[PDB]
Design a protein around this ligand. Structure first.
Ligand SMILES: OC[C@H]1O[C@H](O[C@H]2[C@H](O)[C@@H](O)[C@@H](O[C@H]3[C@H](O)[C@@H](O)[C@@H](O)O[C@@H]3CO)O[C@@H]2CO)[C@H](O)[C@@H](O)[C@@H]1O
Ligand SMILES: OC[C@H]1O[C@H](O[C@H]2[C@H](O)[C@@H](O)[C@@H](O[C@H]3[C@H](O)[C@@H](O)[C@H](O)O[C@@H]3CO)O[C@@H]2CO)[C@H](O)[C@@H](O)[C@@H]1O
Ligand SMILES: *[C@@H]1O[C@H](CO)[C@@H](O)[C@H](O)[C@H]1NC(C)=O
Ligand SMILES: *C(=O)[C@@H]1CCC(=O)N1
Ligand SMILES: [Ca+2]
Ligand SMILES: [Cl-]
Length: 495
């Protein structure tokens, strides 16, 4: 249940589709000094090479083998990355796709990221190796063989998720091949895993696999360190399968978090920020100590999975920064920041027809991540984790770690604020008028640099300055026309 990050580092960043060499560099040049706890990487195992459409991001969720050979790099490059990141105290978490192999309709051949032969039709994946009796063909009871109804908890687990060949996870052989793959990664140095499509695996089968896993590599981690496990389970209610069914294996993705934060910030259906006072379990969310939270993820930022049209992404930059800011300031759950790539989003009848587009590439070869002088990224990588407003809130969370939620204020509409013990305070204005008021901050008297509009550099603030007096009060002014309609100050931004 614990992330295994360095003490004081409270967030992980999803460097979606990034190449291993770029992540290794990012660890040393940015993530380490900026205090990021770790990185969730795209599936490192060999996958189906899909040409129609042209190399979609989702081809990486169709395993061909467990060889660490993908568009992100080979095994040596993967190990190089894990080693370099761990050496600078930044962890690596692997997106483990262990529920299935490729789509059952993919043509047999060597159209895979490493040239491995596979025959979906004959259930043949010799590179593992898996064969017909390693899949759930006979176990599934639907007429299509695919998952047809989420109200039947059994077919959700035993049938094919959108045609993906479903592994017979009850077999010790299959459990062992998966464990062999994950233990290879653990021994290499990975700190944990995102268990892809966990809702599609029986809680008990996952547990059986986890019981085969090693403790983290003792060269970097304390003896007895268990790998961090966060299971992807989309539970927004209305279905028999609940997130809680997986608490015995590790943390679980709380999709209700970003879904509701999106509706609140967009002010849909009369919702407003003042309602966030009891944010957390009060909103029907899972226990904070089991939640892996985020505003958006690789799926719902592009209409895949769940979360709805309410989901906030980098496309909605201004509101997005505020959502990410609220999340990073609030004590609930363990935070994951999304880092994406720009794609030619094209809406037709309310839907993005280019939601399949893969990462920036030159004839299929993923482009490297170029760093600009202003610290942003080129080659179409959005690099949200590098936006000042997000990067400074990542440090905010670290600074206020362990402090209680306190000193909440709200105007009954969309102007709210709250503090984290005597270490940080944040103010939001999502109303269509100015927020100008003196608030109790719970902070020691002094001059504080607002870390949203600026930075504390060389003993001075580059943006807004807040003055806290002896009573802990300070005046805040946020126009609804402000570039970023929120201010955040903390112990380390104090002059
Ligand atoms: O030996 C030739 C044979 O090799 C490969 O077969 C593998 C199976 O695909 C794989 O399932 C596994 O078989 C085990 C069963 O799963 C398990 O229930 C129990 O019966 O033990 C079996 C043996 O360990 O391993 C075999 C052997 O590696 C390949 O996939 C076949 O195509 C090939 O004919
Ligand atoms: O630390 C680097 C810079 O980080 C910040 O720049 C961000 C913006 O804050 C973010 O909104 C986004 O730009 C959008 C912009 O706000 C919006 O008005 C425009 O129309 O669309 C943009 C979407 O791409 O991205 C940049 C980073 O690329 C910070 O504001 C800046 O001062 C820092 O230098
Ligand atoms: C802040 O800026 C002032 C004005 O230039 C400068 O005199 C001062 O030295 C700076 N603060 C620090 C701590 O360097
Ligand atoms: C938590 O993520 C990991 C898996 C469960 C445990 O005890 N540690
Ligand atoms: Ca399954
Ligand atoms: Cl996820």
């Amino acid at each position: 249940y614990s992330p295994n990050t360095q003490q004081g580092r409270t967030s992980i960043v999803h460097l979606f589709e990034w190449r291993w060499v770029d992540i290794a560099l990012e660890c040393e040049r940015y993530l380490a000094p900026k205090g990021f706890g770790g990185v969730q990487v795209s599936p490192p195992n060999e996958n189906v090479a899909i040409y129609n459409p042209f190399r979609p991001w989702w081809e990486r969720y169709q395993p061909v083998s467990y060889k660490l050979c993908t568009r992100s790099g080979n095994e040596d490059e993967f190990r190089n990355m894990v080693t370099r990141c761990n050496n600078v105290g930044v962890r690596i978490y692997v997106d483990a796709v262990i529920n299935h192999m490729c789509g059952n309709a993919v043509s047999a051949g060597t159209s895979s990221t490493c040239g491995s032969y596979f025959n979906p039709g004959s259930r043949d994946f010799p590179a593992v190796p898996y064969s017909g009796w390693d899949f759930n063909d006979g176990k599934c009871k639907t007429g299509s063989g695919d998952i047809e109804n989420y109200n039947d908890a059994t077919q959700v687990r035993d049938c094919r998720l959108t045609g993906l060949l479903d592994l017979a996870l009850e077999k010790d052989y299959v459990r062992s091949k998966i464990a062999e793959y994950m233990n290879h990664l653990i021994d290499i140095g990975v700190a944990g895993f995102r268990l892809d499509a966990s809702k599609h695996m029986w809680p008990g089968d996952i547990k059986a696999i986890l019981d085969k896993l090693h403790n983290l590599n003792s060269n970097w981690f304390p003896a007895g360190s268990k790998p961090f496990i966060y299971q992807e389970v989309i539970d927004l209610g209305g279905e028999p399968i609940k997130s809680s069914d997986y608490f015995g294996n590790g943390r679980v993705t709380e999709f209700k978090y970003g879904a509701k934060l999106g509706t609140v910030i967009r002010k849909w259906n009369g919702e407003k920020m003042s309602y966030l006072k009891n944010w957390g379990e009060g909103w029907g969310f899972m226990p904070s100590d089991r939640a892996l939270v985020f505003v958006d993820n690789h799926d719902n930022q592009r209409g895949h999975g769940a979360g709805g049209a309410s989901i906030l992404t980098f496309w909605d930059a201004r509101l997005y920064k505020m959502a990410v800011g609220f999340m990073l300031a609030h004590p609930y759950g363990f935070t994951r920041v999304m880092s994406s790539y720009r794609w030619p989003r094209q809406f037709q009848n309310g839907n993005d027809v280019n939601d399949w587009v893969g990462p920036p590439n030159n004839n299929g070869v993923i482009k490297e991540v170029t760093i600009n002088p202003d610290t942003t990224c080129g080659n179409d990588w959005v690099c949200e984790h590098r936006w000042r407003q997000i990067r400074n809130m990542v440090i905010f969370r670290n600074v206020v770690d362990g402090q209680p939620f306190t000193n909440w204020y709200d105007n009954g509409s969309n102007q709210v604020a709250f503090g984290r013990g005597n270490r940080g305070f944040i103010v939001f204005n999502n109303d269509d008028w100015s927020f100008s008021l003196t608030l109790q901050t719970g902070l020691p008297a002094g001059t504080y640099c607002d870390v949203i509009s600026g930075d504390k550099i060389n003993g001075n603030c580059t943006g807004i300055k807040i003055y806290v007096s002896d009573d802990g009060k300070a005046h805040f002014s946020i126009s609804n026309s402000a570039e970023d309609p929120f201010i955040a100050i903390h112990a380390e931004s104090k002059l």
